[PDB]
Amino acid sequence: ACLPWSDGPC
């Protein structure tokens, strides 16, 4: 699950 400050490849 993508990160808040580092979403990335969801």
Side-chain angles (χ1 to χ4, degrees):
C2 2
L3 306 143
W5 25 240
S6 298
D7 34 76
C10 299

